[PDB]
Amino acid sequence: SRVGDLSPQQQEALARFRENLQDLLPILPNADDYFLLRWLRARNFDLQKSEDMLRRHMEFRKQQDLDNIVTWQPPEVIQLYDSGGLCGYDYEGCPVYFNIIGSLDPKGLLLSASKQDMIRKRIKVCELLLHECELQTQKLGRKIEMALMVFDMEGLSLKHLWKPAVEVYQQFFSILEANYPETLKNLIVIRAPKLFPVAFNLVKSFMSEETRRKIVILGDNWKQELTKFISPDQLPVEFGGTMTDPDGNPKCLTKINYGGEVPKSYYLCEQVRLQYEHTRSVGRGSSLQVENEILFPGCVLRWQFASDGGDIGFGVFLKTKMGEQQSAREMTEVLPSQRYNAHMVPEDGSLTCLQAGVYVLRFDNTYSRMHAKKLSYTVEVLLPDKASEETLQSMR
Ligand SMILES: CCCCCCCCCCC(=O)O
């Protein structure tokens, strides 16, 4: 349903849509048929829903001053450590953006800056890419409508699954679908480690099916495979091409930021506000066990908790028999129990399950003979996305 071959149904729909948007035409990012058709396709030519979607976007542009975001300067920590960059063009002339996820330190960034600034940095990238598409259109004399995004997963870690960081990427993917529909040609994933299917499963429901269908996972031969999309002379040497910085650096640091660990000197806090699924009392001299059956290795357990009334002990155990509850003496110790000041600073963490069995998170108040505790917690079993898992298996 694109420019050129619209049906009459579609051509009449487009004309009506254009008529219904007369008030907005002078302030649209572009008032051409290409622009309008993105909103129509996103809502199957339902004139009302398409209009609602576009008008919501236009309110978002006003609220966020998006026409001027290309000159917005983020906080120093985001300028220096929030990764990614625009570099090169694909064979059609679409701009390429490198998203260096694996080297990102989103925890350090969120402890040093706001979710709002991290999201605004990512919106800025969208606007920069759109401006680059327009410049390319003018230079090439034909419409360039989309960008190509490469996602470098080298370094992806349990550390990246910190719940507040994940909420950044989830919110961003929701914003992308609502405000930048059909702006990515492909989403090319390189250097995916074993953790990728679990990580991907956390964000997949926030992207549209059309976006998901454009994901391409590359294997060991990714450098050669990338050159099917992008010319070597448009690719950094780091990613298999011939482009360098003026000083010969193969990473093209003058265009692409590679993130890295945020120095502690930038931190403005060391934990953020959390929300919890459950609240329970743990009696004086007592304990609480939260059990989860893991059916295969590679599942990830992730938790967060706070206490009131004093500290709490916490460890992770693995049952040696299924059936009745076992004591800490009888179970295998997976993560040694320790006391945490979870009444002062909430705790969180994760681990990879190396075996199938019943994993038990044990909250220990047995040492506190006079004082009970109130405990709030969330404990989640994170499963792999099955398609991603199969694909990674299939690439050896
Ligand atoms: C093309 C799909 C990219 C998958 C990104 C999943 C990474 C989860 C980590 C969230 C974060 O730390 O920003």
From Swiss-Prot:
A GO term for molecular function: lipid binding
CRAL-TRIO domain sequence ranges: 74-247
Pfam family, one: CRAL_TRIO_N
Organism domain of life: Eukaryota
Domain GOLD: residue ranges: 250-381
Alphabetical UniProt keywords: Lipid-binding, Transport
Keyword presence, Transmembrane helix: no
GO terms under cellular component: cytoplasm
Keyword Transport: yes
InterPro entries attached to this UniProt entry: CRAL-TRIO_dom, CRAL-TRIO_dom_sf, CRAL/TRIO_N_dom, CRAL/TRIO_N_dom_sf, GOLD_dom, GOLD_dom_sf, SEC14/CRAL-TRIO_domain
Reported function: Probable hydrophobic ligand-binding protein; may play a role in the transport of hydrophobic ligands like tocopherol, squalene and phospholipids.
Full protein name: SEC14-like protein 4
Organism expressing this protein natively: Homo sapiens (Human)
